[PDB]
Amino acid sequence: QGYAAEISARRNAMDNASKNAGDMINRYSILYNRTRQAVITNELVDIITGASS
Amino acid sequence: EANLNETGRVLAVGDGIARVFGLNNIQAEELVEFSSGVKGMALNLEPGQVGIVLFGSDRLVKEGELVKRTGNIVDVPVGPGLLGRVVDALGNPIDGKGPIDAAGRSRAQVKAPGILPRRSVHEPVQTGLKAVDALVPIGRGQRELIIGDRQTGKTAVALDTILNQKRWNNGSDESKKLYCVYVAVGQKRSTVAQLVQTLEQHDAMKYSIIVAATASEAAPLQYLAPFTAASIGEWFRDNGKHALIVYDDLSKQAVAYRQLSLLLRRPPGREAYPGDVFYLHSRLLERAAKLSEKEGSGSLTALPVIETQGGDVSAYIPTNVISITDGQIFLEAELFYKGIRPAINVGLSVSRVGSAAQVKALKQVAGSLKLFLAQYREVAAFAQSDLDASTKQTLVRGERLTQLLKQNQYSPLATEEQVPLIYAGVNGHLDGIELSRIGEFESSFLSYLKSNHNELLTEIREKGELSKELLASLKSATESFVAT
Amino acid sequence: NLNETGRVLAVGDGIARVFGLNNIQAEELVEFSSGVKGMALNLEPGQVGIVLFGSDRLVKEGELVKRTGNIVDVPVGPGLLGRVVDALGNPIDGKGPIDAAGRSRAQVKAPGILPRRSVHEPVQTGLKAVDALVPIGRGQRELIIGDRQTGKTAVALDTILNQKRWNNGSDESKKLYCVYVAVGQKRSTVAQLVQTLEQHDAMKYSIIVAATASEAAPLQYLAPFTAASIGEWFRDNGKHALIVYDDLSKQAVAYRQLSLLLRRPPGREAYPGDVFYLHSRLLERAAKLSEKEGSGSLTALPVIETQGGDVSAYIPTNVISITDGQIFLEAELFYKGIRPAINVGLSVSRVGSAAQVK
Amino acid sequence: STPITGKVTAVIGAIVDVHFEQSELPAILNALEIKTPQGKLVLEVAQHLGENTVRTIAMDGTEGLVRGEKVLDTGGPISVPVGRETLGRIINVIGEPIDERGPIKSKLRKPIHADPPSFAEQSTSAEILETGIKVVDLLAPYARGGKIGLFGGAGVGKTVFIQELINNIAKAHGGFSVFTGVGERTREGNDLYREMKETGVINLEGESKVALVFGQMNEPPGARARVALTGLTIAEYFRDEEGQDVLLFIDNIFRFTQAGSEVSALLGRIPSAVGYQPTLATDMGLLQERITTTKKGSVTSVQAVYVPADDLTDPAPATTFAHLDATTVLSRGISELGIYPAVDPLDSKSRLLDAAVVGQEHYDVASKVQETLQTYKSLQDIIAILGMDELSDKLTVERARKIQRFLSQPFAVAEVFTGIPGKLVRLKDTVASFKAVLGKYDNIPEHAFYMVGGIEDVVAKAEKLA
């Protein structure tokens, strides 16, 4: 009963974990793009700026 | 009488580009010859001056030099005369085997085949690689990208393909033959030389043509290399024959065209690449196609190579090519060290045509093989503790299926030697064998077939399909070897 | 006559285009009629690019510009000890003139390969982690890299303070004089530091060259160079000097201003193309001379500021590939209790035990 | 001799404009000289701007240069002394003894700008170069006549790495060796000269086995962007004209393209990605291509490559990779474990790792070593969340903390870093040593394979129970 109440508690413990891992994989996912778009733009600004001469 | 119409004076020179005054009656993308001897092609036709890109060292050119027109757009001699010859980006010999008898010439920039004169890809290009022919089949006229990272086997894969072609190029039937064209763009001469000698020790160099635009040679040469070569092979397509061209590699051609455009004072784009960095690769690849029966039914298959940095495949150039090719073949470093060779990520590597351009005999035995592994990869993590029954067996299959997909270099297998090894896998006649001897199983099993069941192989080779009586006899031959 | 003079074609932003100066040298010093000094950097065919050292309003159109015949140079010697001077060498602490023992140029080439001895003489910072894990050597270049408010200057400062044990002693060879180069900082701060130095009786063996943010861009540009010259006199004369560049990130900032206003093409992050050369020729000057030359050394402790703990940045990477070491101070370890917040994993001293106490 | 006069038109930093008369303009790549009170200023013709004007790149800081000075064309590229007399002498980019030992009794002088061997003059040869280091010799073998190169950022210990190679290989090598220091630390460049003299490789009165070419970072870009070519032309002569085995060391090669970046903008070019130069794959090409093995002689190159911010995607390390036959990637993560060198076994790959090259056995063993490792990097996520308890695979997961430690090799050069006496293992020994471990030698946990020689050393280090 001890290792049965545990397995029944581990499923619970990690169902909240996968869900909590969701507010991360998708939260920082947006932050990756917010950085990718800003990388391509800033990487392109230096080129345009140094092309005006 | 210097009339400025065919003659020109160098207004300025440097950065590998020469601004020239005059040359009034010149065409765009036309070649010109300098007093020094080295030549160049004119890209920028500005009002007063004309921008020419040098094919050699800019030192040779000086200010106030004389420039004469050639009257020729970038063109290269084509025909069978190149088969077994190594030429530069211009069609010039560099192997030292003497001049090259040309069966006519063709521009470097040729319009792609229309929408009407094309035929549904159905003729297969047997690579000889178990993982490739089974999982990601390549069709004639198709365009399968060989995408991956440095030192993963991108070239190793493309090479074995050219090697397996011996089975037909030594034959009499021209409709089954498949001439090859290897475009070395950026590679160092050492490597290109290394490649040739390797193709030589396999007698596959007699039906191949190597175009060499090494890292030493000028940028325009590496820019033209693919286009030029695309013509060399396009000759075969136009005459009812089949040709396979490998661009090793397109990632480096892009850089080359970037170098040209940047110096020519052209508007830069994302990551320095000019605007038409996509139209560059689009022009090229869309030239490869399988013509309709109307004209010749000839096919030009293309296997472009992209060198990806750190695995990133969302970069500008990489994603660009991908969105043009009719499928991708990915190679991971992870699997490469793990022991899986060729290291193919079936989860990402997928052909568009696929089934239609595969041997019907192979399509029958490996229909579910594609799925099996797709589900095996996700269940692979369950290794870390107890297995029921539904996932107890899945872990048994794939664990030896991929172990069988392992194939050593320079050892292409015929489709007649593939189906037996794939039948044993998918159906599950190998599930009960220790992995340690699965490798040696491939050999001993194939030698057992060739010796005792020679007939069973010769009907698959010739028919290419598996009949009810045939496939049944296949099972018996298999379970017979499982005992001994 | 245009040979030695020139009239201003246009002026602004500390930049002054001048017509003439047909015999001007590159990087030559120039004086204006209004009093403000300048410097030639662009010897263009038609005109001349000149960076001012002072205000702009002083210069008008058609104003007469003289030559100096001098390449930027500064007074050097022992007299500077206990004093505070600007980037030009002039005393700013208002304690009378300085005793000039010679004038060494600001653009001094680094000692070649031959006249050099392997660094072996330790520089005791008194700081446990530092001396214990990443010891500093005389002639060695150890960089203090980290974000703001991590106590970068702190580690540097304490080093100067600890050297008191040897500066008040008798043996000159055991002495290690100090040179502090305040660049981009505010005048209020430089006034706080000196207050702390004289509270440990350390000003006597320290020389402070400060080009505060208020001062013109060029003044922050030469600041480290002119400061290196100050510490070179000790190197050239069998004595030991230790120079601290703080802050270096602000020097490059200034140099970017010069170049962008002179209209020189930008490189990465707008920074000029030769921004790596900016710190290469600067830090190389710090070295341990040979025994034939007097075994005089110059220890450099460059300080660079990173944003968001990003060492992968442009400038940070440059200076890193220059120095023979790196003390990376993290902000996380700082508030967690570890002070100084040295990160053992990222910090190393290439010299190593070679210049440590047995 | 026909002296050509010129007038300095403009000077912006290190970029000098020189004017000439009609039809007397020196070609690009040529050398121009300017007499200065202190000495001589050397310039390199870069481009013909028009109206009889040329743009040049300074070889020495043009600080003090007066407008309209008289420039004298030399006729060709900066010619450097080449031949036997070049041995045991440190010369700069321009080509003059900076080791302060009088002039060089050079017979010939060849230009630094020369066209690389053609495709036909190539020599396909795969010979294994035995070094000594286990983590390299086995998993990634150097190629005699091939182009080796080590990558890595600062702090990985590259300059200390190539120092071990010189002691082991250079003395064993039966021929000439040429060292070229580009844009690296001058003090450490001095430690090399201080070392090789006491080593017996450099003798001021006796035999000089190696030549030296320096152009450290403290010098302007123009010189650092060319000093790589100066050392090249020297070793190049010992390949063809001398008919002997050559050995070329570059440090650092990254400073070559880096120097090209500085000038690129100044010269008036539209900057490329990551602020580099539009001509990066061709500059690297027109350099590396000259370092090949021909029918005349062979050249074994060991190039040190610096990685900006340890970012392997940087166009600098990127373009260099494709030129090397073998690599030895240095990572900051491996040294923090204790294992020296800091060689990353999962990015260092040589094209000599072939069954038909090092021997079937060699390859077989080398493949097992690689298999055991990768799984860690991927299966590690289980260890950070639980450890080694869910491992079923369980015998192979532990060999990672044993094999990885056994890769470490002690050196004699780095005595002021550990104080631990060095060890030099050979080729065959490392092979037979690993096969046994791959778990026979699974009895001794942790230390016993740490900083030891071959396999006979492991036995003597297991005795002293720690």
Swiss-Prot record, chain A:
Consequence of mutating A17V?
Lower activity
Effect recorded for T41A: In ATP3-5; dominant suppressor of the slow-growth phenotype of yme1 strains lacking mitochondrial DNA
Q: Where in the cell is it found?
A: Mitochondrion; Mitochondrion inner membrane
Similarity field: Belongs to the ATPase gamma chain family.
What this protein is reported to do is described as:
Mitochondrial membrane ATP synthase (F(1)F(0) ATP synthase or Complex V) produces ATP from ADP in the presence of a proton gradient across the membrane which is generated by electron transport complexes of the respiratory chain. F-type ATPases consist of two structural domains, F(1) - containing the extramembraneous catalytic core, and F(0) - containing the membrane proton channel, linked together by a central stalk and a peripheral stalk. During catalysis, ATP synthesis in the catalytic domain of F(1) is coupled via a rotary mechanism of the central stalk subunits to proton translocation.
| Subunit structure as annotated in this protein's UniProt entry | F-type ATPases have 2 components, CF(1) - the catalytic core - and CF(0) - the membrane proton channel. CF(1) has five subunits: alpha(3), beta(3), gamma(1), delta(1), epsilon(1). CF(0) has three main subunits: a, b and c.
Note from the entry: Present with 28100 molecules/cell in log phase SD medium. PubMed:12898710 reports two tandemly repeated copies of ATP3 (ATP3a and ATP3b) on the right arm of chromosome II in several laboratory strains, including S288c. This has not been confirmed by the yeast genome sequencing project.
**What is the name listed in the Swiss-Prot or TrEMBL entry for this protein?**
ATP synthase subunit gamma, mitochondrial
Species annotation: Saccharomyces cerevisiae (strain ATCC 204508 / S288c) (Baker's yeast)
Curated annotation (Swiss-Prot), chain C:
Sites bearing Phosphoserine, chain numbering: S118
Q: Which UniProt keywords apply?
A: ATP synthesis, ATP-binding, CF(1), Hydrogen ion transport, Ion transport, Membrane, Mitochondrion, Mitochondrion inner membrane, Nucleotide-binding, Phosphoprotein, Transit peptide, Transport
Which GO biological process entries does UniProt record here?
proton motive force-driven ATP synthesis
The residues annotated as site (Required for activity) are S347
Respond yes or no to whether keyword GTP-binding is given for this record. no
One GO cellular component this record assigns the protein to is: mitochondrion
A single GO molecular-function term is:
ADP binding
| List of residues binding ATP | G146, D147, R148, Q149, T150, G151, K152, T153
- Does Membrane show up as a keyword for this record? yes
| Lineage top rank: taxon | Eukaryota
Compartment(s):
Mitochondrion inner membrane
Q: Which family does it belong to?
A: Belongs to the ATPase alpha/beta chains family.
**Subunit note:** F-type ATPases have 2 components, CF(1) - the catalytic core - and CF(0) - the membrane proton channel. CF(1) has five subunits: alpha(3), beta(3), gamma(1), delta(1), epsilon(1). CF(0) has three main subunits: a, b and c.
Q: What else is known?
A: Present with 41500 molecules/cell in log phase SD medium.
Q: What does this protein do?
A: Mitochondrial membrane ATP synthase (F(1)F(0) ATP synthase or Complex V) produces ATP from ADP in the presence of a proton gradient across the membrane which is generated by electron transport complexes of the respiratory chain. F-type ATPases consist of two structural domains, F(1) - containing the extramembraneous catalytic core, and F(0) - containing the membrane proton channel, linked together by a central stalk and a peripheral stalk. During catalysis, ATP synthesis in the catalytic domain of F(1) is coupled via a rotary mechanism of the central stalk subunits to proton translocation.
The identity of this protein, by name, is ATP synthase subunit alpha, mitochondrial
Query: What species is this protein from?
Result: Saccharomyces cerevisiae (strain ATCC 204508 / S288c)
UniProtKB/Swiss-Prot annotation, chain D:
An example Gene Ontology molecular-function term: proton-transporting ATP synthase activity, rotational mechanism
Q: Which SUPFAM superfamilies match?
A: C-terminal domain of alpha and beta subunits of F1 ATP synthase, N-terminal domain of alpha and beta subunits of F1 ATP synthase, P-loop containing nucleoside triphosphate hydrolases
Q: Which GO terms describe its cellular component?
A: cytosol; mitochondrial inner membrane; mitochondrial intermembrane space; mitochondrion; proton-transporting ATP synthase complex
Instruction: Indicate the enzyme's highest-level EC class.
Output: translocase
Q: Which EC number applies?
A: 7.1.2.2
Query: Please, which domain of life does this record's source organism belong to?
Result: Eukaryota
- Localisation per UniProt entry: Mitochondrion; Mitochondrion inner membrane
Q: Which residues bind ATP?
A: G152, G153, A154, G155, V156, G157, K158, T159
Q: Mostly located where? A: mitochondrion
Instruction: State its role.
Output: Mitochondrial membrane ATP synthase (F(1)F(0) ATP synthase or Complex V) produces ATP from ADP in the presence of a proton gradient across the membrane which is generated by electron transport complexes of the respiratory chain. F-type ATPases consist of two structural domains, F(1) - containing the extramembraneous catalytic core, and F(0) - containing the membrane proton channel, linked together by a central stalk and a peripheral stalk. During catalysis, ATP synthesis in the catalytic domain of F(1) is coupled via a rotary mechanism of the central stalk subunits to proton translocation.
Q: What is this protein called?
A: ATP synthase subunit beta, mitochondrial
Q: Which gene encodes it?
A: ATP2
